[PDB]
Structure formats: structure tokens, C-alpha cells
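Lab notebook, page 48
Experiment: co-folding of the full assembly
Goal: obtain a model of how the components sit together before planning crosslinking
Operator: M.T.
Materials (sequences as entered):
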Amino acid sequence: VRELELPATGQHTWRFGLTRMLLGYAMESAQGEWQSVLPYDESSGLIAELVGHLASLLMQLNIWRRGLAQERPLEEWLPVCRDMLNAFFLPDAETEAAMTLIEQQWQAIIAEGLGAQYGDAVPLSLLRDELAQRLDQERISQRFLAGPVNICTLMPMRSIPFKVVCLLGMNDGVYPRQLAPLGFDLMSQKPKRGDRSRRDDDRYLFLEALISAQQKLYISYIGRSIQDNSERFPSVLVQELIDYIGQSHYLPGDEALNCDESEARVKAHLTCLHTRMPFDPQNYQPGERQSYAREWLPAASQAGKAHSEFVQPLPFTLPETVPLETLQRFWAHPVRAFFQMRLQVNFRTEDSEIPDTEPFILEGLSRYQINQQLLNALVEQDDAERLFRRFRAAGDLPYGAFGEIFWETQCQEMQQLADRVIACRQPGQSMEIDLACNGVQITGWLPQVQPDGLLRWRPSLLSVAQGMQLWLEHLVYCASGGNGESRLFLRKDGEWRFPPLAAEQALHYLSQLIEGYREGMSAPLLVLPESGGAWLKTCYDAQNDAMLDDDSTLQKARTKFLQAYEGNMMVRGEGDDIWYQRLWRQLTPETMEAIVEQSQRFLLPLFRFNQ
Amino acid sequence: KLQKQLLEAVEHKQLRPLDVQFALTVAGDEHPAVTLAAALLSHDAGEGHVCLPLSRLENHPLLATCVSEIGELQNWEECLLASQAVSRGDEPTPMILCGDRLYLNRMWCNERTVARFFNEVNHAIEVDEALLAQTLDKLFPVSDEINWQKVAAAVALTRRISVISGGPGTGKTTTVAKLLAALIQMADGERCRIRLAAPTGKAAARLTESLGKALRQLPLTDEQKKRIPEDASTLHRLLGAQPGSQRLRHHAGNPLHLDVLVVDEASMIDLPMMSRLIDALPDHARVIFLGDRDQLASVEAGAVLGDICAYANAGFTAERARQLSRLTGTHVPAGTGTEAASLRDSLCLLQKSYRFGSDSGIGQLAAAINRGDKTAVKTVFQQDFTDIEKRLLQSGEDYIAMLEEALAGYGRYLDLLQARAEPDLIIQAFNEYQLLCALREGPFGVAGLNERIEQFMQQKRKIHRHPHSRWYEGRPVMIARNDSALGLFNGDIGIALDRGQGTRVWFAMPDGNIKSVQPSRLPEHETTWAMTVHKSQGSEFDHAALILPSQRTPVVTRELVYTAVTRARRRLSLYADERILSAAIATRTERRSGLAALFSS
Amino acid sequence: EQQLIEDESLLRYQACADFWRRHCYPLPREIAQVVFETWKGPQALLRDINRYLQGEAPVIKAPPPDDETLASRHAQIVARIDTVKQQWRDAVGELDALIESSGIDRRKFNRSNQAKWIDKISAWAEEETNSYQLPESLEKFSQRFLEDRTKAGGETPRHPLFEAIDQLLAEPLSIRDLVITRALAEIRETVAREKRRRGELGFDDMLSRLDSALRSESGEVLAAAIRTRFPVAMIDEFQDTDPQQYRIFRRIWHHQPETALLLIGDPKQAIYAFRGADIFTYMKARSEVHAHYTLDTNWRSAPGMVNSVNKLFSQTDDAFMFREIPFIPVKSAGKNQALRFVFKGETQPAMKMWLMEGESCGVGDYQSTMAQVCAAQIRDWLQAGQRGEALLMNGDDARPVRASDISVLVRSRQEAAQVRDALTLLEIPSVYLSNRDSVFETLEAQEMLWLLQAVMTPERENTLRSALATSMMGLNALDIETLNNDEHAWDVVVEEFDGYRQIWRKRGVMPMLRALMSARNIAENLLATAGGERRLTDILHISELLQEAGTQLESEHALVRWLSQHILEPDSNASSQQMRLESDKHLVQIVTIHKSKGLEYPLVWLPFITNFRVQEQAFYHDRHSFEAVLDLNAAPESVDLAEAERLAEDLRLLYVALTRSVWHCSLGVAPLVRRRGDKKGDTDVHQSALGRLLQKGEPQDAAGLRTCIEALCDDDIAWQTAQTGDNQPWQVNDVSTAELNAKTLQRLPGDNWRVTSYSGLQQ
DNA sequence: TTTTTTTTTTTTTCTAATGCGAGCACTGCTAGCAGTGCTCGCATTAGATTT
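Observation: model returned without errors.
Model output:
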């Protein structure tokens, strides 16, 4: 780090990570920092021996990175390649050939250098870039006449007669291949007879290809770009050839026509324009242009059936015992539950790539976890300085003063919510829930049940999903039997508050939720808690306890629903989700109405009892 | 400094690179004595030792070499504690100097946790002695002599945490069934939540089947039979161990919702998992452990069951002896002296084996091996016992004779294969003979023995084999990993054959039914002609044949041979040199842990 | 041997991060607070100077001293704020009596508000000057504010503290300019150094290096090397020209004999200002050249469009608001005099402006309504052309209006997407030619990844079921349900996937995917399904890319690793990753105005020509020196000077977009308001390029706009109100399919001929 | 030189501009009060390009 003239940080380096993993193997992370470095708890068992091997690699990578810096004369560069190969590589039956080739090229280069008696030192960047050019200069033409059809480029002085001669890639600019002279060469200034040029070489190879053809000559080139549907041009050679053909021949029945019309007619008759796609039915019409690939025959014939509707009614019987965690995981996302639980389909996306640079700002799940830790520490009235030092040793926070400023801002923002929570916090313990609803038994555990009520807090923005989880827990608590109210204090003064309810109403709403869960297990329950939640927030009126009907409010609710579903450029909307894409690729007004109806029916009590 | 010297230890394969890197990082640029101490501590911790007494640091050959660099130290404690890398626990440091021993900060916490859990946490639960005695008499008819099963049940019912040690085939499962029956019958109205755990899925399924079949036989009402545990799980699944991260679903803050827990095969339970389990238990849960102390120790660093049962040799407490005599209605012997009353009372040892009689050669051989007396083992071999056999294996011509004997060993299985029988009988027959080798590769090892046996079955007509096919009919396989979809566990065997619909592998489920699986559907697997002594734990074979290499390796030890001997049901054969067997039995495996000192102080 | 790189984003971001690490880290916590307030990190910091980094460096007006460090500026600002706070502390008691005695209206200045403001300012002054933040009440206590509100002919309270506060609040205090200049220098330096180290090169780097070489001592020789090689050079589209390009062309071909130079360009078409081009350098060139030549006649479009454009640009004087750019009427040619466009038997006017209804219209409402109207009108045109009614006629000759000849010109990408969605709602085929999106960002990439990942390890049921449930397979929910129960079907699927894995190992990538598509009949079902054609094209393109990437990568798992990596970070700039054309049939071509330069389109649509933007940033050109000047300060003079050039650029863009059509061009007009309040008042149409030419640069209401549109209307220009289009899908008559049969091979080709050695025979 | 396990989800911008609501000082009309002019503060909503 200091070699690149950058300020020494001491974190986010291979040494830092290695020391961290070793400390985590030695000391559990629960203990704390030892040398301002948080031990990495993951590597704790015998598997941590891998670390010992990895730390053996980097050390080597260190040593050599110091040895190769200084310039050396040629004779000193001789044992470098062999030493590096035997140190870094363990040969095998297949790789031995490549290692021998590398050694041979390196030794040949250094042998030429020593035969030239170059005394001065040579930097590694020269030999590396020379070996890179020398290694790929090789070509393999040992299968030119093996027996199968020959595929090869146009090479000068290779003229062999063949019955069928095909030519590809004749687009203007690709062929002939142009290699201009260095510019200070004296030969190109005053040329004489016998001077060779790549242009004339290709121009003569095109004639050799024509003369060598005994039976059939095939020429092809790209006319239109597949990407942009633009127009390309063929080589000047093909152009002169087709011009000569059209000027030297005439089709039967065109005797009356003049020279130009007959020439154009011949040129259009010989030039064949193939389709853009293989499944084009024109390829399969009877004729000389008829294809031989039957795989694209049913597609060209348009005989396939379209994909039927993914939604299908499936039989389901509700068991006698349903854990509360099942209902919670269902109501978190009803469609994702039907996909993951009912038919066991999981769409696991690939994990994110390692970030290129050390964290400068904190956003997303990282800052969310940091805020969660900070909040859970502040509500317990613990020292924030300990957590700050812990995160600094972990390296998650930015370097130096910026990390302190970020921590101070987050501390203020979380201290507001912590004061709000401590205002109402009381000592509470967990409890067990055994309940019966609609002939279905629910068994679960509820944590932090204080005599006052169900108190929950999360450092997130006010969202409908959290309200639904709290409402399910509240119905469970009320139906179980207790005198309390449900509260949830979310970021930016968000508040979800539910008053106590009688046992009968609690059981009724819980039975309704269980019925919805059963219907979801039968067919995918189209209930969007966020977009539909916005629709119901716009339509419903808390004062009259009745939803509006006027078409103006309907248009406003549709606009709000579309804004919630699609979303802005900065924040992705609720519609952008892997599960929703499977059900429909584009949102239709009928599906919109169905989602609105279901979401209203299911979320009406949430907005009703929210105060 | 000492870094250049430590670079040489890697070349001689004496010090692992992990240890070298750990020493270089933690010890830093302090005195070379600190670096050497750290390297030796890391090495001993990797090899399975928990602690490192400073007496051990007194003159490993590397230490003798580095004597010149470190010089002479009047007190190792002073030099070590002076550095920042070592402390007494006041401030978090990687290494901890506890008394006369050295610990890794991770190991020390788990050691202290296990110590305090076995010393102070456990309490004595009080119940009616007359009612308990009546229940146990209804469970155990014989009162003429001391029944160790009855004493074990009494101990487990009295104390909160109790461990029952005994050899294979000593009636452990039956004793646990009687224990759980008496426990359910004792508490009528109170909810009794029973949980069953095992460190391996195979042992978990075996525990499910055995406990079920045992509890169904004992007379119980529909109320009691409704509290029977549904299934037994793995320790990890019980604790909700996530695959990638080390976070536990049930941490210290979130206790397990259990009343009684039974962990089978505690011999494989290591120290870290033991501590993490202890951290998740509540204050009202009673825990019972099962395992054999002489059985091979756990893989990772640590040895809990052994270090615990080491104190069981002293015997019961004086007052506890009279208490159990009043309970069991017999005379219970009393251990002389008082060293640790709680631990000694929480331990019971089953000394009776119903499976094999004392007159059997297997039992006498196992006893002689456990006692470590080579002359006793040789005398047992010399005696006229029809169920023990020994063959000298020095030259390859004796290896060929061993293969010839393995031929007759697999004879019935091979005949049933060549006769086109049903897979059920073939699977039931395949478990009659098994080879057990210590090493994995080389001349004596699974990878080598499988190839040699296949070449020998190709030489003499037993089973046809295709080179390109790789799936010739008749080859047995075993699974490397657990699979919940197919319902097959790691360490379970299967037989690949062609019934006529196609080449499929048949497995025997714990319900007795046979399940056919496609070769493509199978996960990672390996040919199981010969098994390692480690993976052979829990299984039982009618005729077992152990193979010990000629070389001297730290793998071949006393506990390995003990497990290999106890592995067979009726017939056991050995292939090893006369001197190598004696040298292996003479050496006992030790894993240094402060438990011996902790429980005494 | 030089290498070429098209995208320099990574190197630029790395240089910015290096600058941030070098400078921001050592800073003390108190200056770090002020730095953090302005920018959160190097990511946002690069966003401000991204434009300035590209191209030639811009001259910064009033640059900070070279030796002034950040700490010096911090100390200066802290000292100023400390002086202000001390002057407030000393005058904390006299101000009350001063305000009370002097005569100022207390309705505007309430006593309670005055006391609150005094309290807040006192609390701020007593506070330590940790940050540059200043309270709002200081604006109330400024001398100018007090002078503004006072009794007519009465005593005005004046105190030196008020004058000091007025002098302070006159200019904002910030470290922005110094850090911005330091970064603009150091990041550019680092990028150039790293590119020299790697031996790479880029377009801007090519131009700058050629310019530097020519300016160098040896460049003279190099000049001859360029001069002798090309005696005569003709530059086309010269209106978009960079100062570097013109300096090069002048250095090479200014005064040397036997070397001509022909510059051809139209200043009315200078629209690439954002790309670094400048009209001021073009005018400098125009001044530096003595000879001028002009073309009189327009050969592109019908005579109706010519007269329409001439009448619309003859409304005002100096329409392009630049004295050096005079507009003159043009005359159509004799060949085009017969051009006409007939719709349902009635000849349509060459130009038709669609005026929206209402008084105040928002940006989003305008976009949605105009998109819908344009979609409806294009659907009607297609319906009338499918029956042969609507014809583009050159005299007696005619031809129907195909979906290809109709183009919709858009300014931005989001605009194009808004057009395309509405156009696809009516089941009308269309394509956006300026789309730079990557194939990997679509869902087909993820589906192909899931398929490959399942095929690689068919043993795992989870990944297999995941790949089966993809839309590409087309299975239902009952299908998956039944398949998760029956073991035989699952076994058959596992077997077919295992065979696919064998094919993948042996014959490569493309054969496995081809066999899979053949057996599962994916292509047939996709072509059958509505819209699945684009899906199949994307799948084929992904297959070709996977084959190209697996050719180089020898390991089978390495291809999956590469595909996952590319899905994680799709590269839009990559030409290979650009999405191919959906179909070869007639498609409505949505194209940006910049990409339509120099092209030709029979029928043209401008749904959102009226929409404009007000430039907040201050970057302009000096009217005297004609040099690019960036003002890091928010001085309103620079802002107005930049807004004038923005309006000129918008007028030129309007000209370019209008001159594209041949027969008919339609365009939207609506009373677009950019200010939330005073919607009933004057609209902001006059700020728009089109509005300024319709309203003669005079603000008017919706009624005034309508009256001006009616006044402008004539035989060529007709206006019609815009209403919500009817939601009816365009009906296309299906065509019967003839019998199709592929050929068979009677003679099998023989591989008997071969060349082998003893090793081959033995094997 | 030997080896056991386990499956799940978590987040989303910020600045700016205005409309209205509550409070208040002034002042003109018939000393108080209603209107008026004004102002600050809280909630709500809109918008962020082009090779």
C-alpha cells in the first residue's frame, strides 16, 4: 500500500484478512478486539487449516514480488523462469508439455540475448511482453489433409486443386487484409518488380482460389447486420467477379432485353438472399433452396401449442397442526410461499461478487444490519463506544473521521427511536401458544410478551408487510387470551398500533387468515401487500369506516397502485420480483382488478384497526 | 529471527504451515521462546490436544534445536505472560496461560463451560424413593444380585445430568428405554417433552428404530404412548446449525424448549459442539448421554466422554452408595475416598455384556486389549477359542492368502448374487462379512483394497466386470453425504444390481423395506468392499476381518483395535505382525486437557 | 503496437478513489465534517466531474491559488464566521432598541418572530463554529432585508452588524471549488499516467495526443507526414466540431500550398454540444474563412413540409437567437412537386400539430396522453394502409403505409420506453434503435443460467426443479405438482439431463442446448405463444454468446462461472451484448433525434417535442474570447448565460427533428407547466423551443396558445385536439401456410478416408 | 495420517416547492373586534436526457 504512495490504512488487505482469520481461529469473536482487529469466527475448526495453506501462497507471492522488481542482466534472468515454475506449479501429465514449451521459449529468448552479448540490465516488463508475443505466434496445420473437410484461412503459396471451393467472410473491409508498411521503409517509396505486399498477396490468393476450383465455387458474405438491420457491402473482388459475370452472360428468354437489364437480372438470379432466422418457413418451401435441418421444421410450420396458464387449481387438505412460523412465512409473501412451500420451487439467485474497493459509504443490507445492532444495543442502554470500536476493528465502517461522522449520524437517528422504545419498554418474557381455529391447531412461541402488550421495533421504513406480521401476532395474542395492545415503532416516526380485541373477533379474523392460507396453498393468492396496500390506503376512509366509490378516487387509487408497482428510477418497485414475473410478464387490467379485490378483502382489517 | 528456523519444520513435516503462520502473526517480534511456544501450542491443538502444560515445553525436536536461540529461561511463565500475546483472562488475548498450561482463547472458554456445567450446574432431583423403587422393580424382575442397569436408571432419575458408559452390546438402548418409561410414569400430569439427538444421521435413524421398538414393547397407557418422541435428529439440526455461518438458531439467549434430552453415541461428541449444546440448554432440562469411553475418540480436537469416565473408575460416593442401595433394594459398592462427589455420582458404568459371554474369545480379547497387556493378548490368541483367528501378513504370498480367505468370507453373498435372488436376501447376506482397514490408500487401505479385490474377482470367476461401464452388477456402494430427499444417510450401504427393469441400487430402509435408486440419482459414493475403522462405528457385522499395515503410523492405536474387535458379532479375524500389534496396544491415546485438574479443584 | 479500449469508466473510478484516499483520509475530523457534508464519498464525487473529465479540460473562472490548501480555506472561513459571531455578541442588546425606535412596518416583522429570531441567532453565535451551517434568521437580519421592508419616508435601522451580515450572506461559504479543481487535475493526471503505463489508448486520448504532438516541436515534421499523405481533405458534418479537431485541421491545412480543404456543415444542426462539440468554434472558423458557398434548393421532402418549416421559422426575427446564424427561406425542387399523402381518400396536410386539452398539464400527464394519442393515430394509419387506402404518392405512383416507414423521434430513453409500451399495448410491432441495453439483464439470461446449473448437477433435485419451473420450459403448476410425486417421470428427466451432460462434455455447448430445445419443443411453443419470438431470439443470442465464451474456456464449470459473473454485471457498452432485432418484419422505428441526423423518414412523429429542461449547472462560453468557462460558483450570470445556450441548442434540436420528414410529420403541443404554483397564470411553453417560435417569445395562457396555433394554421399546417385513443387492438389478417417438408439424404457421407499412424492403429 | 454436520430471509432518495392551517400584529370600523395582510410550520407531491 505504501509502495503505491497511498496512505497506509492497515485494513482491507490480504495481511489484514489473514490476521483476522487466524485470530478467529484462535479466539472467538465474542471476546473482542485484541490488536484493533476483530477475529473472524467462521474459520474455527479443522477446515481453518486451509488458511494455513493460503497464507503459504501469499508469502511466496510476496517474496517473488520483491525479487522481480530490480532490473537484472540477461544471464541473471536465466534461472528465474525455472525457479518460478517449480515453486508455483506442481506439474502433471498434461501440463508438463506447456511448462516445457514455456521453458523452451524463455531459454531461446535469453539465448539470443546472450549471443548478442547485451550487457545492460533488462526489466521484467520487457521479457514478459516478449514471451507473451512469442507464445501465441504458433499455429497448428497438421490436420490440413487428414481426410475430413478442410477449414482454414487463406495462406499465400498454398494452391491445391479442389472440387468444391467455398469462401466465407468477404465483407468489405475484412478481405483483403490490409497491413500498411511501417512508413519509414525505403522499399515502399520506390518499388521495383518482385516486391511483395499483403494486399497483392490476398488479391492473388483470390485468383488462385478461383483457378483451383474444379467443379463448384461457393462465395458468401454478410449483407445486413443482424443487430441493427443495417447494410454491409461485399469485397471489391466479389464485386468485380459478379460484374464480369453479369456482363458476360444472359439468361434464356432475355434476348430482347438490353445489356443492363439482362445484367441486373443475371446478378439477381445468382445472388441468393437467405432468411434471418432458421425457423423461417421460406427455408422449408420445396425448391433448390430447401434446407436439410428437420429440427426447425415444426417451428416453421407453426404447429406448436402456446404455453397454458401457469395458474391451476390444485387439491389441498389442511392438516390438523399448523405451526405459527408457517403462517408467518406465508403471510410475509403469499406468492413466494406458494412457490417455495407448495410445489417446492426455489429460485436461488447467484451471490454478489466481491466488491472491488473498501467501503467508502454504507448502504443497503450492510447499513441495515449496522443500524439493527446499534438499535438493539441502545435499547439495552449499552455503551455505543464498544460497538463503534468493534465495527472499526471489523473494518465495516469507513476509514478515519468519515466513519466517526457516519456513526454519529446513525447514533442520533437510532437514539431518537431508542428513546421512543425505552419510553414504553417493560420486562417481558416469551410464552407458548396452543390454539384451535376452524378445526386446525396452531402451536407456536411468542417472544418478549410484556404485561403491557406486544412491543416490537425495527430500524426500517413503515411498510405493510411488517404491519401484517404484527397483526398476525396480535390476533394470536388476543385469541390466546390477554389484555394488551400491539405496538411497532419503525424508522422515521413510523407507528403501527393495534388496540386490544375480544376473543371472538380475534378468533374470527384468525380463521379468516387461515382460510386465506388454505386458499393460497390451493391456488396462488394474488395479494400484493404494498401496491394493494396503497390502493386500500387511498380508497378506505377511517372516519366513516367505509371505502369510497367516486371515480375520481378510483383514478387516484389506480395512479397510486401503478406508482407502487412500477416504482421510481431510484427505488425498485414491488412489481420487479422473480416470483411475480413467472405468473405474468406484463400486468393486465383484469389481473389488476383481481389483485385489488383480493388485497382489499385481506388487508381491510389492517387499515381498519390501525390507529 | 526464529522465522527462518520455523521455515525448516515445514520441510520435515513436523509443524503444520497453519501453526507457523499463527506463531508469526500472533507472537510478532517478541522473544523467540514465545514464538516457539505458540507454534508448539498450535501444533498440539491441531493434533487434538486441548491444552499444553509448560512441562511439555521443557526439553519436540524443534525445541531442542531452538534451545540455542531461546537460551535459558529461569521461568517460562514470566517470559510468556510478559508478552502481549498471553494473558490470564483480564484482557482478550489469543493465548491464555492458565495455571501450568497454555490454551487457545477459543479452547479455554469451551473447557471452562464444560467444567462448570459438569461441576456446579447439575443438581439432585428428589422424588419418592418407595414409588421409584416399585416402578424399577416392575421394570427389572431380578433382585438377587446387583443389576447395573437398575443402578444406571436410578442415577439418571436422581441427577439432572447423567452419563451411562458401556461397551457395545451391553444393553444400553434397553436401559434407556426402561429409563424413559419410568420417567414418563413418574410424572403423570406434568408435560414431558422428550428429545433425541445423535451426532450422525445413521446413528439417529438407528436410535429412532431401536427406541421405538423398545418402547412399544413396554406396557404403557395411551397417555404415556402419546409422549413417545416422534423422531430423533442430529445435534446440528437440533441446535439449528446453519451451513455457511456459525450462527446458531438456538443461542445462549434462546434456550431449547425441552424437558429431557438423550444424546446417543457421545464418544463422537467433540468439545466445541458439546459447549455449543450446553449453551442452548435451559435450567430445568435433564440430559442423558450414551457412549463407550474406550471407543475411538472424536475427530476434532477434544475428548469429553473419555476424560469424564476416567473418574468413574474411583467409584460412587459413600452416601450415594447407600442411597442407591436403598433405591435398588440391593447392596451397591462404595468408592473409597472423596475426590469429586457430583461427577462420580453422575457417572454409572455398565460392566455386563449380554451379547457375548465371558468365555467367548471376542470378550477376552477385547478385555486384554483394553488392559493394554500384550502377553495377555498373545495368550488369548494361543488358547483354544473357535471364534478368534490370526494370520501373519508380511510377504505378498500371505496377502494372497488373505484374499483367498476374503473369498470364502463373501462366499454366501456371491452365491446369492450369481443365483439371481431378490435384493432383500442379498442385502441381508452382505452384512455377514466385512473387512476393516486403518489407512485409506496404499497397499492396505480402502482405495487399494477395493482395487485389489476387484482384480481378484476378475481373476477368479465370481462377478463379471466391464471396464467402460463402471457399474457392473453386484458391486456394493456406500454414501459419502447425507441426503434427505432419497431418505438415505451417510455411512449407509447399498447393493447395485439388475432386477430386469435396469441397473439400480437397492438400499435397506430402517422400516425393513427396500428402496431402488437410479445410479444417476445417487450422490457422492464409494465402493465399500473394505471400510475404515472410523466409518465402521455403530455398525455390526457377523464376521469382521481387521487389517493392520506393516508400517508404524500414529493412526493405529489401542482404541482403534478395540473398536475393530468389538465391531464383530460372532467371528473376528486379524491380519497384522506380532510385534506391531503389541506395540500398538502398548501405546494409549492421550489428549491433554485441564479437566483432570479442574474437576479436582 | 497500441491497444484500444472503448470504456474508461473503471480507470476513471479508480483514479477518483485514489484521489479520495490520498486527500480526504489524512484530513482532521472537523474539516472532514465539511467535506462529508458536500460529498458522501468518491462515488458521488465522480458524478459531479464526470462530464468535465471527458474531453478538453475546461477553463475555471476565478481559480483558487495554487498553494491554498484545504486547511487554509477552512481557517479563513472559520475566522470570518468568528468575526461575525463576535460582532453579534457585542451588539446583542442594542438591536432591539434600534428596531423599536426606528420606523419599520411591524406587520411584516412581528415582535414574537423577532424575539424568536434573536434567540436563535444568539444560540448559534454562542455555539462553537464546528461547521459552516448558518441559521436562516441571519437572512432576516440582513441590511437589504431591513431596507426592503420599512415605512415610506421613515427612519431605517442601520448597524454595522447588519452590513457585516449582508456582506457575509452575499456569497456562500464552501470548500467545493478547491476540491473540485484538485480532483479535476489529479484524476485526469492519474488516468493519463495509468493509460501510458498499460500502453492503451482511447478516443479522447487519441485526439489529445495527436493535438499535443502537432503542437510539439517535432509535430511540424509530423504535419508534413500528414500533409503529403493527404493533399485534399473534405470534412462533412462540420457544425459539430471540437476545438481540438479544428486546431488540428488548421495546423495541417491552413496556408500550405497545393493543399485544399472543404468544410461542409450547417450551424442550424449543431446538436452535439453535450458531447464536447461547440458552435462558437464553428463560428470562429466561419470568421477565419473568406469564401462561402450555399445550396438553395431542398431535395428531401414534399413542397408542403418546406413551406411549413419556412413559415414556422419566419415567425420571429433571429429565431436561433444568434446574430451569426440567420435563417432564410428555402425552395423545394421540381421533382418533389407531385408528392402527396392520401388518408382515407383525403389528402392530409404536410404538417399537423396535435394540441392537448386543458389549462395546466404536468410532465407525466403530458407524456402519457401524447404517447396514447400517438399510438392511436399510428394504429389508425396502419389500419387504413392495410386496406390500400392510405398511400404515399409521387404523382400517379403510390404504395401503402407500412409499419417501417413510420418513425417516432424521441429525446431520451425513458421517453422511448413510454412510447414503446403504449405502442405495444395495441399489439403493434416496434423497435428502439438507440437501445443500448444488454441481453444479460433480461430474464432469459437467468433462465439459461438455471438450466445450465441444473444440467451440470442433475443429482440435486432443487436445482433441477428450479430449472424445470422456468418459463422457458413452459410447464404449468399441475405439471410440476404431478412431477414432484411420480418417481418415474422424475427419473426420466434426470436421465435426459444426464444425457445432456454427456452431450455437453463431448460436443460442446451449442449441441446440448440444441438437443434440449429439440426434445422439449421450446422453440415451437415460444413461437406459438404471443410475444415468445423475442424470447426465442434472446435465447439464441445467449446460446451463441455462451458458445463463444466456452470456446476459450476449457473447463465446463468455468463457463457457468463466467455466465454468472456476466449476469451479475451486464456491460451495456459491449457491442456483442447488444440486443438483436426482434423480427425482420415491419417495425415502428423509435430513434433518438441525435441518431436520426442525416437520415430520411417518410412519416415522422414528435410526441414530446414541447418538453424541455432548465439547466441548473453553470457552464457556458465567453462572448468575447469564445472559450469554454465553468463557474464552480452559483453566480446567476453564468446560469443565465448557460440557459440562453441551452435554449439555442433546443431550437437547433427542434430544427433537426422537423427537417427529417418527407411527406408528413405530426408533433405534440400542450400547455406544459414546469412551475407547480401559478398554474392558472402564464404557461412555460415560451421557454420551450417550439413555444418560443409559436408565441414569438412571449408568455401566454392556454387560450393565447390556442389562438396563436389557429393563426399559424393554414392549408399546410392544420391543428386537431388530442383525445384519449380507443383501446382496440390492431387486427392483422392471418395468412394460410402451405405444406412444408425438409429434404432427406439418400447417400450417407463416408469417413473411411483417413491418415493414421501406428499409435492410432494400436491405441 | 483419521473425519461429523446443517438450508433463510432481512433495505430502498433527496431536495424542493406549495397548499393550507394556526397564530399574530395592525388597523379601520363600530376600546374592542373583525377583517386583513402576513408569516412560519407541517404535510404532501413531483422529478432526476441525448455518441
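Interpretation: Chain C touches chain A through 75 residues (CB under 8 Å).
Next step: discuss with group before ordering constructs.
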